[PDB]
Design a protein around this ligand. Structure first.
Ligand SMILES: Nc1ncnc2c1ncn2[C@@H]1O[C@H](COP(=O)(O)OP(=O)(O)O)[C@@H](O)[C@H]1O
Ligand SMILES: Nc1ncnc2c1ncn2[C@@H]1O[C@H](COP(=O)(O)OP(=O)(O)O)[C@@H](O)[C@H]1O
Ligand SMILES: Nc1ncnc2c1ncn2[C@@H]1O[C@H](COP(=O)(O)OP(=O)(O)O)[C@@H](O)[C@H]1O
Ligand SMILES: Nc1ncnc2c1ncn2[C@@H]1O[C@H](COP(=O)(O)OP(=O)(O)O)[C@@H](O)[C@H]1O
Ligand code: BEF
Ligand SMILES: [K+]
Ligand SMILES: [K+]
Ligand SMILES: [K+]
Ligand SMILES: [Mg+2]
Ligand SMILES: [Mg+2]
Ligand SMILES: [Mg+2]
Lengths: 525, 525, 113, 523
């Protein structure tokens, strides 16, 4: 297909226009006074969303060159959506700032390669500076505060997240489901998580998060390897007959053939997914049998004389709801044998003392933890479907932010941390003046998140930024009450991880695009 | 497909215009002098309707941005209907009012999020105040008044419903059926209600409520679980030879596969529905045995030595009509034998004494209620087809409205309640000036229902409002006669639930819409 | 008065607490007060200095403290003598207001084709 | 009339485009081996012309906004050519080179004011370097060469100018008139010169040259600060009988009465001008009397006892022609008591020995030179009237350029100077990146002229330019010969004023455009 080709500043200006369109879409949402975007999910009702990644995904433009600019920047938001969710809007604002300042410096005739190189140097230093700046976040009050802030200053979500994490243990898995009614509810149920996920992306389902989930799924518990569809046909047959979803757990699968089988058979009949078996060897079988009682199944295994040709609708376990991603699976709640589940808990913990050898004790204490910890499930209460989805997305941000906080600690929120590290890096220099100007471009872009936060308030961004820069330590601006003070005392906390991630990804994508000299795209016909 | 993007006031005006188009369509219908709307239908005869849900669900606009506004405000209306089945128009009017006044306040530069927050605070206070204001409804005459006022001041319909519930009891199930002719008819028949809906939306029949209903169905009576459609092929053959639908009552249905395959193989040759067995465990068996006798069928179980393929057309129960919704199935009647009904009544009635223990007597009294009580059925007599549907809609509204008035009592109708509660909340305040202005926006909207009702009269809305405002308690305006007086003496009684429902959903949706800066929609091509 | 629109921004900052009988009047008051800053910020913008920073510094510094666009230095407006006759400021303001009110209330315009 | 109005980049792009069309038209012609430009004349065959002033003059574009861009540079270029006799297209080329990069930088988003400052900064430095580089044009050889360059390598013109300045001195006054048909000639006459202009502007000549000049001027000389100007009425009546102008040289003049009468009643049949005499006191007296004798008249005052009420047409002086402008007066040729004028010249030479005050020693040593052969009159000739006017115009241009040269010395031509100073300033830097680009824009443009000169030759501009920069001093590329060498030894030498003026005006326009925020034009 014939290509259009543009060069130099004619290309770069079109790229920057498209970047701006995307950034303007996303950035309005930033901070406590940022306000929602309506996305026409034209298959249904439009969705109100404040999540910057959800906005970015939809944005894509008619002009092929402006579209190319947009589609590059969307990467930063998507990557930032990984690495614990929160930080997508700040990542996009940073990206825009670096691009804009970089392209000005390129118009001044600087070597864009050296500008990129300088940007990368500054950013690496900033990461280390944040690393040192970070303060551990252990107390429940800090956790709660982080939850509220990521919840868009919603105190209730902070309370629930803190109580849930403190009830299930810092490591326990928490999941969020649509509201049974107007009130949010917290409760705990006998589930477990394990570190294996779906074996093909074609299993991806409704959520854009790269996840698949199943309601009332059957649960296969295979010790065999799936060398070909000849192993699976009896199992698929039984499940298809049962007309209810299936989770395949197997030691190995030639996933390409399975995907072809999925396209042919599972066009519109039954939802099915496959995952790698847990652990290995004895650990594998232990988890397999653990799931079997948790689900009410049996261990399909040739050592028991059972075979996939023999697997009945009851050797297949069952689950009430299951959520799976490309790397991890969680049973939200099993059918299970309650009394037998708890009895096994006692038995496995007993094996901790028998198997006193360090790593067998380790494997046993892992078992009791993944079993007895259960799962806490937050119910997101809201009167309306629109409010349902909106509140749910904010609760999800809270969980991911809180996970990150307990991982990597916290830093002054409101954009203060970035400006602080920026101020500490003022002495940094590169090999040559091009790199030096690149470093300054990066250090200047770091102001952007604060300036945008205040601008959403409709305050004078430069005034506030100047004041904050004139302060020291956690001195910052409270955008929700227009009071300067110690962000920590106000509890305006950001997880170090999210701020780090946003900066790194923005820097990488931004530095690359600055290097563009030419674009080739389909001719607009 | 390329997205259009709009920002700030350019988006909000488009949103508000769409909202106005929908609201103006719907609001005409409000109150006793409110007009009918004529809805185009592809099939043929346009449907005259007064139901605000019916109108809202068709409104859909060509310009993508006003379309987004309309598809959103449609949700409040349908949520209102689902929550209580009545009060859709008042919900919409409120919603539109809130949106209009909120967007005004946003144009004053107030923070949209604080406006939303303020509105929700006012609405929480107003809901609790309505609850305190509410008065229980128990007297048959009050019940009738509610029905008439819901029926568009149709004395006859409210009288009928009052007699019906006083006969069948307030908790028995009442159903509305197409008239035999000009006379309305009420009769009692040995119908049955059990709390299991359609297991798959594939069953959804033609009616716009999205329900599956079958004329003269056979009633499958399998307490055994199915395994796949393969079980039913010879039965489905016999049913095709009869040429009538079949209700598949089964303990479990492979609906994901089985329903799909039933649809694909039948393609309308035979209508088939699948429903869960009533209750669980022994309940399923004893209850299913009961319904068999009432329908004159046999339980397909080893207790009879019967199997799914073995069921003759005569083993299958026979009903004149069966109605299935998303959560409830009711057998309108069974052929059975009235002598057999009485004999069963005696045997189980006696057996109550043998099983007097708390929860056993509970289930047994459930069983007599759901057996002796019978089904009340209202035949909506109307001279012509369009009048048929229009009147049946009104009677359905009356039944929902009346069944809600016994739940939560009644309040001063005609919009008095809202005004009254609004006036009492005048002293409510928020954390800041923006929330204060949001509270005032909410309280001001509360008037809107009365004003619209008055305007439909062509009377002077502000004058009526000020007079009602100046009055106290149930003092109100009688739109049907243009007399001020004690609304309760007149009986213009609104169920508290509808009012509460309308307000909450109105506020919930409207609150989000204030906070919009940006819209993303497919580019108009 | 202190020239360079200092006078206007000064009085505007002093009246910030003013408000009227209803939200509509309040918006009207806020619109008027925002305008009074406009001249200064313009003057600055022409210089290509940061209008917001200058404005905030002037609002901070009491009385005749202001920005001299000829010299790019803050100081006492009077001492340098960038000083407007009060009449000029007053007149400008009132007349400006007049037009504003006039066009707000107008409903109909008539012209040749 | 309803006007198109547009702002910001909408303005920038249109001017840039318009400026570009101009420059590309002109620049090709820059230097001696310029490219031809076929200028259509509707009458007939087009004028193939290598002369860029003519091209530029003739370029006028159809889009109103684009026309702005062209006319701006034209005007500013023209002014450059007025400040000094050369540099129309050089100022143009520079203009383009600055503007283009400036507007690009502005479009990218740098602060327009900061670029302005940075350009201004680099320009000021370059002017200082030019001043240092200048060498005086002391030698008639240099003078001759100067004329050549300003004459498009017309050796003859340079010869004529140099001959004139030898006859009258560098500070003497040369003048040019239509001559003896085929043959050009030079001769000298007893004119006069002094650095005083008109006391009121309304005297301006019929043409818009801004001077006033008078044919057969009568001359009145009085050491009086006349106020009521009552006594002059008989003089006006006598002069109106003669029908010829009168010049009044005074201590002060009541212009609010003379100029009034000169505007109203003297509807063209007579013209008058009024000027201060130079110096003061006994200097002014001696100046007045000597100018009178040259003009064949007498000093007139009540102290003389014979006044404007009595002064005959012969008490007043006379001249064949006189020129007056806002800053200077020159009597072309007094009628004079020629024999008594030389006698007085000798007497004034004696008076050099009679003075003792140095301000009067000055008055004498100047006026003796200013009297002795005070004016030379170039006569232009050609085989046709069209060549006649062509050659006359070029002569005048060369004259002006030569004047500038002796004022401010000369520099290595061919853009050697510019490139030289540009290389010297490469270390300059500004306050911030915006000003830095401004400097780099300015410094890059100074190269442009040279490169253009070379590129018209169709040599490789960059090799040449780099060789020049790698050389030292006046080393440069002689485009008429492709030889490298010392520019001055070739005498391919620009007057410094040309270079300075060209540059500064270039920068000036560039600045205006960079800060141009809005433009208003008819539809
Ligand atoms: N009350 C507050 N005052 C100042 N800044 C805040 C406040 N609440 C949140 N923020 C800041 O706004 C950002 C959080 O808003 P959010 O829309 O979640 O951005 P992101 O999507 O990038 O996480 C963080 O930079 C946080 O520091
Ligand atoms: N006779 C009456 N006088 C005043 N108001 C009335 C009268 N009858 C009904 N109304 C009011 O009209 C509204 C019901 O109109 P309806 O079309 O059913 O709207 P909705 O669909 O919201 O119930 C209620 O507020 C009710 O109180
Ligand atoms: N040197 C200066 N620095 C700052 N402001 C100045 C200076 N000189 C004049 N002004 C201000 O410029 C404004 C008027 O600008 P001007 O272009 O003259 O418009 P106007 O013709 O309406 O006065 C006045 O407020 C005056 O005080
Ligand atoms: N023989 C030559 N070699 C190189 N440069 C020359 C030569 N003759 C003239 N120049 C240069 O040409 C430039 C002037 O070109 P010209 O066409 O006269 O433009 P303008 O008259 O508009 O200034 C001057 O820089 C001058 O030194
Ligand atoms: F970037 Be966010 F907090 F969704
Ligand atoms: K956001
Ligand atoms: K209605
Ligand atoms: K030339
Ligand atoms: Mg967040
Ligand atoms: Mg109703
Ligand atoms: Mg020349």
């Amino acid at each position: 297909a014939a290509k259009d080709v543009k060069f130099g500043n004619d290309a770069r200006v079109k790229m920057l226009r498209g970047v701006n369109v995307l950034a303007d879409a996303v950035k309005v949402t930033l901070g406590p006074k940022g306000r929602n975007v309506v996305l026409d999910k034209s298959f249904g009702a439009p969705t109100i969303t404040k999540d910057g990644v959800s906005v970015a995904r939809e944005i894509e433009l008619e002009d092929k060159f402006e579209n190319m600019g947009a589609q590059m920047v969307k990467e930063v938001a998507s990557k930032a959506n990984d690495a614990a969710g929160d930080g997508t809007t700040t990542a996009t604002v940073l990206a825009q700032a670096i691009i804009t300042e970089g392209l000005k410096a390129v118009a001044a005739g600087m070597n864009p390669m050296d500008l990129k190189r300088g940007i990368d140097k500054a950013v690496t230093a900033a990461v280390e500076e944040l690393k040192a700046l970070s303060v551990p976040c252990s107390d429940s009050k800090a956790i709660a505060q982080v939850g509220t802030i990521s919840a868009n200053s919603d105190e209730t979500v902070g309370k629930l997240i803190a109580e849930a994490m403190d009830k299930v243990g810092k490591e326990g898995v928490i999941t969020v489901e649509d509201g049974t009614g107007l009130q949010d509810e917290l409760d705990v149920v006998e589930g477990m998580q394990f570190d294996r996920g779906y074996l093909s992306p074609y299993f991806i389902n409704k959520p854009e998060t790269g996840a698949v989930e199943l309601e009332s799924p059957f649960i296969l518990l295979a010790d065999k390897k799936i060398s070909n569809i000849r192993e699976m046909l009896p199992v698929l047959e039984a499940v298809a007959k049962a007309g209810k979803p299936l989770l395949i757990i197997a030691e190995d699968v030639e996933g390409e053939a399975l995907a072809t089988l999925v396209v042919n058979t599972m066009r519109g009949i039954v939802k099915v997914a496959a995952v790698k078996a847990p652990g290995f060897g004895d650990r594998r079988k232990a988890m397999l049998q653990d799931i079997a009682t948790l689900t009410g199944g049996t261990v399909i295994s040739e050592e028991i004389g059972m075979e996939l040709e023999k697997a009945t609708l009851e050797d297949l376990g069952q689950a009430k709801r299951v959520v799976i991603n490309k790397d991890t699976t969680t049973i939200i709640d099993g059918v299970g044998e309650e009394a037998a589940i708890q009895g096994r808990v006692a038995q496995i913990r007993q094996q901790i003392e028998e198997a006193t050898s360090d790593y067998d004790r380790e494997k046993l204490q892992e078992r009791v933890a993944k079993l007895a910890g259960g799962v806490a499930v937050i119910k997101v209460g809201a009167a309306t479907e629109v409010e349902m989805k909106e509140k749910k997305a904010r609760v999800e941000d809270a969980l991911h932010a809180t996970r990150a906080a307990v991982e990597e600690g916290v830093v002054a929120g409101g954009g203060v941390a970035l400006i602080r590290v920026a101020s500490k890096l003022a002495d940094l220099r590169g090999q040559n003046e091009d790199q030096n100007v690149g470093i300054k471009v990066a250090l200047r872009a770091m102001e952007a998140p604060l300036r945008q936060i205040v601008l959403n308030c409709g305050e004078e961004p430069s005034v506030v930024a100047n004041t904050v820069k004139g302060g020291d330590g956690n001195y910052g601006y409270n955008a929700a009450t227009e009071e300067y003070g110690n962000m920590i005392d106000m509890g305006i906390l950001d997880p170090t991880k999210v701020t780090r991630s946003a900066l790194q990804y923005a820097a990488s994508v931004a530095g690359l695009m600055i290097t563009t000299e030419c674009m080739v795209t389909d001719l607009p016909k």
